[PDB]
């Protein structure tokens, strides 16, 4: 009943998380989308493929596989869009004003208007990316944050998980200390990073609403997988 995750050291945890990272995928090379149909066609196709990788990433997060299948399902159903969004914002960091959905699909807020209700979400994403950039978010910190989302977002809509969450907190502090931050800088930065998780949640909620409206507008069919992830949010 004991999880290997708790026996790992800070560096083993970080290396595990870094090693679990999914690949950066490409968009279909066709369509420069200026229609609602083509825009959402490309993004939904990409999301579909990203989800499969996310599911296999989650299985590689220490402590996750220790949960029942039902618990794993619940956590992923709750966090999937938050997880896609934090990845997007991270990939877009070194591209101010741009959202790097894929290396061959780098979009801006102008792009967003060609889809009713999308420019609002684009703006929130861009704002978050900029915040990450100014904070000089490190990749080691990013993978910790992404794992925190997976384990935290659905945890109150249910002990092991909280212990693993604590471990990840220890891991974040470990990284900041390793980087030479003073104690006060350590707790302040930890707070700043975790507060951004509130905004990521907000974006996910708003995005889920938008995705639902697009489903009812039926301008593009969604996959069975994407539909089931959306339906989980009732």
């Amino acid at each position: 009943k004991n999880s290997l995750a708790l026996s790992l050291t800070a560096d083993q945890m970080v290396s595990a998380l870094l090693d679990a990272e999914p690949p950066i995928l490409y968009s279909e090379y066709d369509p420069r989308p200026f229609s609602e149909a083509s825009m959402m066609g490309l993004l939904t196709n990409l999301a579909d493929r990203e989800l499969v990788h996310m599911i296999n990433w989650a299985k590689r997060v220490p402590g996750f596989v220790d949960l029942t299948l039902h618990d794993q399902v619940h956590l992923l159903e709750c966090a999937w869009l938050e997880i896609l969004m934090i990845g997007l914002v991270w990939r877009s960091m070194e591209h101010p004003g741009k959202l790097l959905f894929a290396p061959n699909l780098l979009l801006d807020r102008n792009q967003g208007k060609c889809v009713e209700g999308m420019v609002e979400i684009f703006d929130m994403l861009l704002a978050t990316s900029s915040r990450f950039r100014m904070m000089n978010l490190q990749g080691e910190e990013f993978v910790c944050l992404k794992s925190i989302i997976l384990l935290n977002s659905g945890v109150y809509t249910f002990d092991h998980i909280h212990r693993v969450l604590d471990k990840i907190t220890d891991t974040l502090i470990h990284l900041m200390a390793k980087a030479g931050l003073t104690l006060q800088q350590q707790h302040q930065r930890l707070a700043q990073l975790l507060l951004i998780l509130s905004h990521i949640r907000h974006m996910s909620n708003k995005g889920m609403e938008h995705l639902y409206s697009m489903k009812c507008k039926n301008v593009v069919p969604l996959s069975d997988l994407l539909l089931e992830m959306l339906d989980a949010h009732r």
């Binding site: 599911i55 399902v73 069975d224 997988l225 992830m229």
Partner: peptide, 10 residues
Amino acid sequence: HKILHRLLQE
């Protein structure tokens, strides 16, 4: 019956 239930086991 969820696709997620299957993908998590695959």
